[PDB]
Protein backbone atom coordinates (compact mmCIF):
# COMPACT_ATOMS: atom_id res chain seq x y z
CA UNK A 1 0.00 0.00 0.00
CA UNK A 2 2.28 2.78 1.30
CA UNK A 3 5.97 3.49 1.08
CA UNK A 4 9.03 3.40 3.43
CA UNK A 5 12.78 4.07 2.91
CA UNK A 6 14.87 1.34 1.29
CA UNK A 7 12.06 0.36 -1.05
CA UNK A 8 12.39 -0.34 -4.76
CA UNK A 9 9.81 1.65 -6.82
CA UNK A 10 9.36 3.01 -10.35
CA UNK A 11 9.64 6.73 -11.08
CA UNK A 12 10.68 9.13 -13.86
CA UNK A 13 14.39 10.03 -14.27
CA UNK A 14 15.30 13.49 -15.65
CA UNK A 15 15.92 11.98 -19.11
CA UNK A 16 12.08 11.48 -19.31
CA UNK A 17 11.87 7.71 -18.84
CA UNK A 18 10.73 5.33 -16.09
CA UNK A 19 13.28 3.44 -14.01
CA UNK A 20 13.80 1.37 -10.93
CA UNK A 21 14.37 3.68 -7.96
CA UNK A 22 15.28 3.06 -4.33
CA UNK A 23 13.66 5.49 -1.87
CA UNK A 24 16.66 6.59 0.21
CA UNK A 25 14.74 9.10 2.30
CA UNK A 26 11.28 10.43 3.22
CA UNK A 27 10.54 14.11 3.90
CA UNK A 28 7.38 15.99 4.68
CA UNK A 29 7.45 19.22 2.73
CA UNK A 30 4.81 21.95 2.68
CA UNK A 31 3.49 24.01 -0.25
CA UNK A 32 1.19 27.06 -0.27
CA UNK A 33 -2.07 27.56 -2.15
CA UNK A 34 -2.86 31.20 -3.02
CA UNK A 35 -5.52 33.17 -4.95
CA UNK A 36 -3.87 35.60 -7.34
CA UNK A 37 -5.85 38.83 -7.80
CA UNK A 38 -5.90 37.86 -11.49
CA UNK A 39 -8.35 35.06 -10.77
CA UNK A 40 -5.82 32.25 -11.07
CA UNK A 41 -4.07 30.26 -8.29
CA UNK A 42 -1.15 28.10 -7.29
CA UNK A 43 -0.65 25.33 -4.77
CA UNK A 44 2.93 24.45 -5.63
CA UNK A 45 4.34 27.44 -3.76
CA UNK A 46 7.19 27.33 -1.32
CA UNK A 47 6.64 29.31 1.91
CA UNK A 48 9.64 31.53 1.09
CA UNK A 49 7.73 33.03 -1.84
CA UNK A 50 5.35 34.88 0.52
CA UNK A 51 7.43 38.03 0.87
CA UNK A 52 4.85 40.04 2.87
CA UNK A 53 5.34 38.13 6.15
CA UNK A 54 7.84 35.47 7.19
CA UNK A 55 6.19 32.10 6.85
CA UNK A 56 9.39 30.09 6.89
CA UNK A 57 9.85 31.33 10.43
CA UNK A 58 6.27 31.88 11.73
CA UNK A 59 3.97 29.47 9.81
CA UNK A 60 1.22 29.98 7.20
CA UNK A 61 -0.77 33.20 6.88
CA UNK A 62 -4.31 33.30 8.25
CA UNK A 63 -6.73 31.82 5.75
CA UNK A 64 -7.97 34.39 3.18
CA UNK A 65 -5.07 36.66 4.25
CA UNK A 66 -3.95 39.29 1.70
CA UNK A 67 -0.37 38.34 0.73
CA UNK A 68 2.56 39.32 -1.54
CA UNK A 69 4.03 36.47 -3.57
CA UNK A 70 7.15 36.10 -5.64
CA UNK A 71 6.06 34.21 -8.76
CA UNK A 72 8.47 31.91 -10.66
CA UNK A 73 9.70 34.85 -12.73
CA UNK A 74 10.89 36.26 -9.39
CA UNK A 75 8.35 39.15 -9.74
CA UNK A 76 5.93 39.99 -6.89
CA UNK A 77 2.16 39.70 -7.26
CA UNK A 78 -0.82 40.34 -5.03
CA UNK A 79 -2.73 37.24 -3.82
CA UNK A 80 -4.93 35.92 -1.01
CA UNK A 81 -3.91 32.95 1.20
CA UNK A 82 -5.97 29.84 0.58
CA UNK A 83 -4.22 26.97 2.28
CA UNK A 84 -1.03 25.17 3.35
CA UNK A 85 -0.55 21.66 1.88
CA UNK A 86 1.73 19.36 3.92
CA UNK A 87 2.93 16.74 1.42
CA UNK A 88 5.04 13.65 1.99
CA UNK A 89 7.81 13.74 -0.63
CA UNK A 90 9.98 10.86 -1.70
CA UNK A 91 13.66 11.11 -2.39
CA UNK A 92 14.58 8.21 -4.64
CA UNK A 93 17.82 7.13 -6.30
CA UNK A 94 18.60 5.64 -9.69
CA UNK A 95 21.37 3.24 -10.73
CA UNK A 96 23.49 5.99 -12.21
CA UNK A 97 23.32 7.45 -8.72
CA UNK A 98 20.95 10.32 -9.57
CA UNK A 99 18.32 11.48 -7.13
CA UNK A 100 15.03 13.34 -7.21
CA UNK A 101 12.59 14.44 -4.54
CA UNK A 102 9.12 13.51 -5.72
CA UNK A 103 5.37 13.16 -5.00
CA UNK A 104 2.64 10.79 -5.78
CA UNK A 105 3.19 7.80 -6.84
CA UNK A 106 4.85 10.00 -9.17
CA UNK A 107 6.61 7.03 -7.71
CA UNK A 108 4.58 4.09 -9.05
CA UNK A 109 4.74 0.83 -7.09
Amino acid sequence: QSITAGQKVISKHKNGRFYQCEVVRLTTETFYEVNFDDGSFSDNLYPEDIVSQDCLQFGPPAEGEVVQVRWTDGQVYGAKFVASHPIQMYQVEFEDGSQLVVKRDDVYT
Binding site: F36, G39, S40, F41, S42, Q75
Partner: peptide, 7 residues
Protein backbone atom coordinates in the same frame (compact mmCIF):
# COMPACT_ATOMS: atom_id res chain seq x y z
CA UNK B 1 -9.86 29.36 -11.03
CA UNK B 2 -7.05 28.56 -13.45
CA UNK B 3 -3.68 27.06 -12.63
CA UNK B 4 -1.18 29.91 -13.31
CA UNK B 5 1.83 29.80 -15.67
CA UNK B 6 2.35 33.57 -16.51
CA UNK B 7 4.02 36.16 -16.57
Amino acid sequence: RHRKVLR
